[PDB]
Design a protein around this ligand. Structure first.
Ligand SMILES: [K+]
Ligand SMILES: [K+]
Ligand SMILES: [Mg+2]
Ligand SMILES: [Mg+2]
Ligand SMILES: [Mg+2]
Ligand SMILES: [Mg+2]
Ligand code: NA
Lengths: 66, 100, 243, 151
RNA sequence: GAGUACGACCACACUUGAGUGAAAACACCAUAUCCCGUCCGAUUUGUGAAGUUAAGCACUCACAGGCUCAGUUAGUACUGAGGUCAGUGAUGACUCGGGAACCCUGAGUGCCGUACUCC
RNA sequence: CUGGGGCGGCAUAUCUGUUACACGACAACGCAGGUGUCCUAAGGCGAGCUCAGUGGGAUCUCACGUAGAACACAAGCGUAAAAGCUUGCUUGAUUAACGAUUUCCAGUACGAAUCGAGACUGCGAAAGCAAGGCCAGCGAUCCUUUGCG
RNA sequence: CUUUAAAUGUGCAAACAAACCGGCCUUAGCCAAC
């Protein structure tokens, strides 16, 4: 009343194929990594965002003036 | 001159075995084993000698003797082995015992 | 020792066969944090032969260790020592000279002068664990670490020179295990050679009643009371002209 | 018969003949950065931070570095899809990988060719295929035949 | 051409025997009041230079045994694919491919770094 | 559960070697054995030593000795200036902001394990090592009970 | 049981969200410092 087999399983698995892995640049979360480096990275990202806002404002002013 | 066979250590053990070891070295140990030599009349059996060079003969005596420079084996740093020629032989030990 | 014995036999490393290296200690000595990506890390090698003292600053590498500075006890004649070359005072001088040479090479000299004099006291070393000083760790090799050894004399010399070697004063001569304190006066006595002077004086008091020890010292006019000034002059010359 | 962590590893986790011993100093001095390609090979003599027996021959990329540990991303097929498993091991159980060596050599060679073309030096003559034909002048000629002594 | 200190690879470097070793080193070696440790200054620790190359160490030598690299073994053993092949069967041959090992015989017996020093 | 059922036994949770076919996976009332405990040291660290055995000599002494011993218990793997033996100090067998992960796997939990951040500490001259004894030794809702705030 | 060791296997890589070559900005992150 208890039987085990692996007969049809490979065919079933390959019907809709073995899907490949997600590219490494996606779902690239950093949670659980080394905290001392994580904190410094966060500070640098904040500075970068401020810089991007300033750059856009400068672009807008230049286009308007000339 | 470094091949001069000299006495290194003399150990005396008393085995009571009921409900003791001691080693002596230096100019004191030479003063000892004079009582043993006198008691044995400067005469012991040939089979008492051992192939290494040591020998011995209540308190049981045992004297181990060899050339100098055997530190290269008991040294901690850069320990090595002493040459076989520099090791003392049974016949040489017997000759030394007869001479002294 | 049959043929099978030789067929299955793994030889040890070469420098373990010759009995020069303790690899278990060397691994933990060169090991560093992996989150540092190979920042420079130096160790202080102190080796004492029968008639010489060698002290060098070493950095490990895959191709082989690289040496940054090196001091020897036989360069002390150029500064004014010609008698001991092995005792505690010689060790202190060697350490101080090595530290001065290394700081002069790095150019960080004139910023970390350590202590201008010697007192035998213990002052904590400043480490990251105001600009920080050069830092190295101490490798004593296979030597036994007992209180009052010469390796710790070299260490004290380097620390007084100005390097930052972490340490505790549990192995300096004037240290009592029960009292858990240090005797800076005893340490200064041993640095400047009071023990050598006293032994020489006793030997000169003897060896005259009966007519090898201190043969050259006695042949020269080395009076047992011309030692502390000699060592102070040696220190001043070393600090003045390390090169 | 039992689903233990280290079941059936008697030959897998075992030192090679006359190669026993703890890791060397070059292993300790090797440098690993995030984004490197590494091989996961277990060392039986460490026993701290070993990976599971599944990951003993796989190659992955580094996503995390700690004081004495590495984080590696490794693919694993489970039924109809492939997972991205994240394993934490000590630094003794990983080894730098030469799987991109040929690609990097190709890139360097192309850059060298571009530099030579810009400079003006003469390029080496291109290689010749071995599938072409030509006149063959033989030094020795023999007869191929079964002889009586062969059986 | 050498020596010492720190080393990477970890026997072509190991194990067993002889011969040689300029200078400088490295060792044996002398000693025990002070720091230090023991039944024992033997090991270890301190303080020194009277004797040497005896020993360690280095080089050369030796069918040495081991180790390393080739050749024979051998297109053999085994093996992926094929047949309404053979044989009662064990098994075997053929067609398109891959391809060893023990043994046996030749050659060899460390190499590469940083610093200081003596020829 | 069951080569009908009953009697017997358990593989009914769980570990090693094998079955098993050189990645991983792989069954039988298949084979040979284990587990529900034990340890304030049999845990942590530093130092000093070298084991099993063999030969010669009067428990002691010398020479050899690649691990043939020992690691609480079954087996496998690993280990020689140690991971074994002796010894000195100790309580990292604590706490650890709901950090991440592996094995089983439905990619759920439980048990076990790996890489970490913070506190307060232990050993060590130092670099360092230690949040038990590597890997088997264990348990939901409701209810009772203790601590905290 | 064992070094030696196949054939069939099995992981990864092979230029457009990648990588390469010289300015600059930010961070304490490391280092005695840069
Ligand atoms: K079924
Ligand atoms: K000694
Ligand atoms: Mg398998
Ligand atoms: Mg130890
Ligand atoms: Mg457990
Ligand atoms: Mg256990
Ligand atoms: Na969580």
């Amino acid at each position: 009343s208890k039987n085990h087999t692996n007969h049809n399983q490979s065919s079933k698995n390959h019907r809709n194929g073995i899907k490949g892995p997600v590219p490494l640049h996606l779902h690239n979360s950093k949670r659980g990594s080394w905290l001392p480096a994580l904190v410094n990275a966060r500070r640098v990202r904040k500075h970068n965002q401020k810089a991007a806002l300033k750059k856009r404002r400068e672009r807008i002013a230049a286009f308007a003036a000339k | 001159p470094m091949r001069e066979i000299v006495v290194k250590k003399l150990c005396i053990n008393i085995c009571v075995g009921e409900s003791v070891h001691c080693t002596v070295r230096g100019k004191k140990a030479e003063e000892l084993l004079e009582k043993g030599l006198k008691v044995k009349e400067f005469e012991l059996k040939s089979y008492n000698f051992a192939d290494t060079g040591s020998f011995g003969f209540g308190m049981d005596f045992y004297v181990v003797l060899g050339r100098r420079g055997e530190r290269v084996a008991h040294r901690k740093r850069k320990c090595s082995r002493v040459g076989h020629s520099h090791h003392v032989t049974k016949e040489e030990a017997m000759k030394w015992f007869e001479k002294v | 020792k049959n043929k099978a014995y030789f067929k299955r036999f793994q030889v040890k490393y070469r420098r373990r066969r010759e009995g020069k290296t303790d690899y278990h200690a060397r691994r933990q000595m060169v090991l560093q944090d992996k989150t540092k990506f190979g920042s420079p890390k130096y160790r202080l090698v102190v080796r004492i032969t029968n008639k010489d003292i060698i002290a060098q600053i070493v950095q490990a590498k895959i191709v082989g260790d690289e040496v940054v500075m090196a001091a020897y006890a036989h360069e002390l004649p150029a500064f004014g020592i010609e008698h001991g070359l092995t005792n505690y005072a010689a060790a202190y001088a060697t350490g101080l000279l090595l530290a001065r040479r290394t700081l002069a090479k790095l150019g960080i000299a004139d910023k970390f002068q350590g202590a201008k004099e010697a007192d035998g006291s213990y002052s904590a070393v400043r480490t990251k664990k105001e600009r920080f000083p050069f830092k190295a760790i101490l490798d004593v090799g296979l030597a036994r670490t007992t209180t009052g050894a010469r390796v710790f004399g070299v260490l004290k010399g380097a620390v007084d020179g100005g390097m930052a070697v972490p340490h505790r004063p549990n192995r300096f001569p004037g240290y009592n295990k029960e009292k858990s304190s240090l005797d800076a006066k005893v340490h200064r006595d041993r640095i400047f050679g009071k023990h050598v002077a006293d032994y020489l004086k006793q030997v000169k008091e003897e060896a005259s009643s009966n007519p090898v020890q201190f043969s050259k010292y006695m042949a020269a006019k080395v009076l047992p009371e011309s030692i502390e000034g000699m060592y102070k002059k040696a220190h001043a010359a070393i600090r003045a002209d390390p090169s | 018969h039992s689903y233990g962590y280290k079941s059936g590893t008697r030959h897998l986790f075992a030192k090679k003949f006359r190669k026993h011993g703890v890791p060397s100093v070059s292993t300790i001095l090797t440098n690993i950065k995030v984004g490197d390609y590494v091989d996961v090979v277990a060392d039986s003599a460490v026993r701290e931070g070993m990976p599971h027996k599944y990951y003993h021959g796989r190659t992955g990329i580094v996503w995390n570095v700690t004081p004495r540990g590495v984080g590696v991303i490794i693919n694993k097929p489970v039924r109809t899809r492939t997972l991205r498993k994240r394993i934490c091991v000590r630094f003794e159980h990983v080894r730098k990988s030469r799987c991109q060596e040929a690609f990097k050599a190709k890139e360097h060679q192309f850059q060298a060719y571009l530099a030579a073309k810009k400079a003006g030096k003469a390029l080496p003559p291109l290689q010749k295929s071995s599938r072409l034909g030509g006149i063959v002048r033989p030094k020795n000629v023999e007869v191929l035949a079964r002889r009586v002594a062969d059986y």
